[PDB]
């Protein structure tokens, strides 16, 4: 019998310590997305097959749109292009059991069908149009100020006015 | 009678703070180059053209080539493609009197010539192969271990392989 793994960012906007975001990953209805992301939090898996460690320690969100979603997670290449999971360079889809129906959702960033590493989002709105596209695999539990404050450095282009790092990152 | 200006960066690496930067800038030599340098560690000219803020806080060295230099300073971009002076867009090349004939020295980066705005970079060697083709406008004197180990972030293709962020900048 196994719990939802709790996972945390702690962030900074602009060179400062704003605060933590707390993750709860549905590790009962998607576990190989759920686990990849716990894994990449705590680089429990040491140096991936780009040479990187497989960590979302110093990433940032390279792509944060108002009124929608801020997308991070690219360690490899920091700025949308990277990113490996810990199954490889790509994943499939894993199920798309749960909808995009409320903020603050966890869901796999892509460049369409079943290419999953590491760049994740989070949304700040309904987004069910990304339902059967993205696969959501957890939510925050805490810190969704924290995740308007991102946002709030977002652009409608997805381009920051501002860079927002994951500073540190673990389970908890 | 006028006394070179002193900055400073706050440095961070990977999320964590290792230390500060400072910089002595040769306005006796490149006054009009040195003094956006200046005005852009201290954020005093307020927003920019583009609508950003005109300061240095919070940007990244997108750009790390080690026995080479690092690059940053595009706070409007935050990946090499942009950046503003407080003269405008662009401004000229001042002049070439000082060459990178040494270690740790301050110089401007540019797509040719009189390119210049708001990014700059450090060399951590000689490279008097840049001389006539980028100003040199101030030195860093103090923090050089700083500079060195985010050079040890750095790829030959220039790809950062970690996150160096000024979390902090202004004018001693």
Tied chains: 1, 2.
């Excluded at 108002?66 to 920091?78: E, H």
């Excluded at 490889?88 to 909808?99: Q, R, T």
């Excluded at 959702?105 to 892509?110: D, F, I, R, Y």
Aim: charged share 25%.
């Amino acid at each position: 019998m196994l719990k939802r793994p709790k996972t945390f960012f702690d962030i900074s906007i602009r060179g400062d310590k704003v605060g933590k975001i707390v993750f709860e990953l549905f590790n009962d209805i998607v576990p190989k997305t759920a686990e990849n992301f716990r894994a990449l939090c705590t680089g429990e898996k040491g140096i991936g097959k780009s040479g990187m460690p497989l960590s979302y320690k110093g990433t940032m969100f390279h792509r944060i749109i108002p009124q929608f979603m801020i997308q991070g997670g690219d360690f490899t290449r920091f700025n949308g292009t990277g990113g490996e999971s810990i199954y490889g360079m790509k994943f499939d889809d894993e199920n798309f059991k749960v909808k995009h129906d409320k903020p603050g959702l966890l869901s796999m960033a892509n460049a369409g069908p079943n290419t999953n590493g590491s760049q994740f989002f989070i949304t700040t709105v309904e987004t069910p149009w990304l339902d059967g596209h993205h696969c959501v695999f957890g939510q925050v539990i805490e810190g969704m100020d924290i995740v308007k404050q991102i946002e709030s450095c977002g652009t409608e282009s997805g381009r920051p006015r501002a860079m927002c790092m994951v500073t540190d990152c673990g389970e908890m």
